């Protein structure tokens, strides 16, 4: 894709820059390869339930009155109060997942090809009211990850950002890893916002464990949390809670120092994953 001013005499081919979804309008952050004909109109209109993308307010309004979807496809594997997660296999809901990937790419620097959804499972987060289940965000996961990634992409839609939904999704990804009896880590590279979110999540989990146990190796923490030993080490380093002794990382902290960290404004997830509300078994 091109940016900047086009040369003298040329026509700028417009990309999608604004979407209307439910009762939100959202500006694009990046180019997404919707077909060129969809980019030329002032807005792209998305059905908030089936994610079909449309070119006109009038086709949108017709769709709104006809489409019977009021939630994501697939299985509702998590429900606590009005928060739900649906598991959507890319092989079985190809069109929905393609629509989701084109949406997501508007807010991601890079992504795998939007049509290549079969290798992935998608976990869709919704807030539920009387009208339906309204998409907040999602993460995707490779069914088989050569690199041991437990998340491929993660997104909270911009109007829902900074409310804890991203850390909910991160927590959720590690609950899956724990049930699979494996460690995992997000696919690299992480965006700057990605880095802040993961570091916040990892810090909170590790601090919480170091005070609930009170004191427990890095291996122990990894097995308990499914966080990789490398991500534990980088997080403990940022907490000033690790020493290096003859080439080996050694946790070094007291209960008092853990509490100082937990009592500070820098480290309290507004919504957490309740295992009792999760219904999921590993495939595998
Ligand atoms: C796995 C590979 C990838 O997917 S890399 C790409 C990751 N995704 C993206 O960059 C897409 C666009 N961004 C997003 O969707 C969101 O920013 C993500 C990364 C999902 C975070 O979601 P969100 O629901 O806002 O997270 P959260 O409320 O749970 O807060 C997480 C911590 O991050 C911080 N944070 C967040 N946004 C900002 C910001 N604008 N400026 C400064 N800090 C920010 C929050 O304060 C929070 O940290 P803390 O717990 O308050 O210390
Ligand atoms: Cl916006
Ligand atoms: Zn629809």
UniProtKB/Swiss-Prot annotation:
Binding site for acetyl-CoA: 154, 156, 162-164, 166-167, 191, 200, 244
UniProt source species: Homo sapiens (Human)
Regulation: The acetyltransferase activity is inhibited by anacardic acid derivatives.
Annotated propanoyl-CoA binding sites: 154, 156, 162, 166-167, 191, 200
Catalysed reactions, as listed in the record: L-lysyl-[histone] + acetyl-CoA = N(6)-acetyl-L-lysyl-[histone] + CoA + H(+); L-lysyl-[protein] + acetyl-CoA = N(6)-acetyl-L-lysyl-[protein] + CoA + H(+); propanoyl-CoA + L-lysyl-[protein] = N(6)-propanoyl-L-lysyl-[protein] + CoA + H(+)
GO cellular component, one term: nucleoplasm
Start and end residues of each stretch annotated as Sufficient for interaction with KANSL1: 11-284
Positions with a binding annotation for Zn(2+): 47, 50, 63, 67
PTM text: Acetylation at Lys-111 facilitates cognate substrate Lys-binding and acetylation. Although considered as an autoacetylation event, acetylation at Lys-111 probably takes place via a non-enzymatic process following acetyl-CoA-binding, which primes KAT8 for cognate protein-lysine acetylation. Deacetylated by SIRT1.
Residues the record marks as active site: 187
Full-protein positions shown: 174 to 449 of 458
Gene transcribed to yield this protein: KAT8
Location of this chain's protein in the cell: Nucleus; Chromosome; Mitochondrion
Record EC number: 2.3.1.48, 2.3.1.-
All residue ranges annotated as the MYST-type HAT domain in the record: 11-282
Zinc finger (C2HC MYST-type): 44-69
Protein's recorded name: Histone acetyltransferase KAT8
């Amino acid at each position: 894709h091109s940016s900047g001013l086009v040369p003298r005499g040329s026509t700028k081919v417009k990309y999608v820059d604004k979407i209307h979804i439910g009762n939100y309008e959202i500006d694009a952050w990046y180019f997404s390869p919707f077909p060129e004909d969809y980019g030329k109109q002032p807005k792209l209109w998305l059905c908030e339930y089936c994610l079909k993308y449309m070119k006109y307010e009038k086709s949108y309004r017709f769709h709104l009155g006809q489409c019977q979807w009021r939630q994501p496809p697939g299985k509702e594997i998590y429900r606590k109060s009005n928060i739900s997660v649906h598991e959507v296999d890319g092989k079985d809901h190809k069109i929905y997942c393609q629509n989701l990937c084109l949406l997501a790419k508007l807010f991601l620097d890079h992504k795998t090809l939007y049509f290549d959804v079969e290798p992935f499972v998608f976990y869709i987060l919704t807030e539920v009211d009387r009208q339906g289940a309204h998409i907040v965000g999602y993460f995707s996961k490779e069914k088989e990850s050569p690199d041991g990634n437990n998340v491929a992409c993660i997104l909270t839609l911009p109007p829902y950002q900074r409310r804890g939904y991203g850390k909910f999704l991160i927590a959720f990804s590690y609950e899956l890893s724990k049930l699979e009896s494996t460690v995992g880590s997000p696919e690299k590279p992480l965006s700057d916002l990605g880095k802040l979110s993961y570091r916040s999540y990892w810090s909170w989990v590790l601090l919480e464990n170091l005070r609930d146990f009170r004191g427990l190796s890095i291996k122990d923490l990894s097995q308990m949390t499914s966080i990789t030993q490398n991500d534990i080490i980088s997080t403990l380093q940022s907490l000033n809670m690790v020493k290096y002794w003859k080439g080996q990382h050694v946790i070094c902290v007291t209960p008092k120092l853990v509490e100082e960290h937990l009592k500070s404004a820098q480290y309290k997830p507004p919504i957490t994953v309740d295992s009792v509300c999760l219904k999921w078994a590993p495939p595998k």
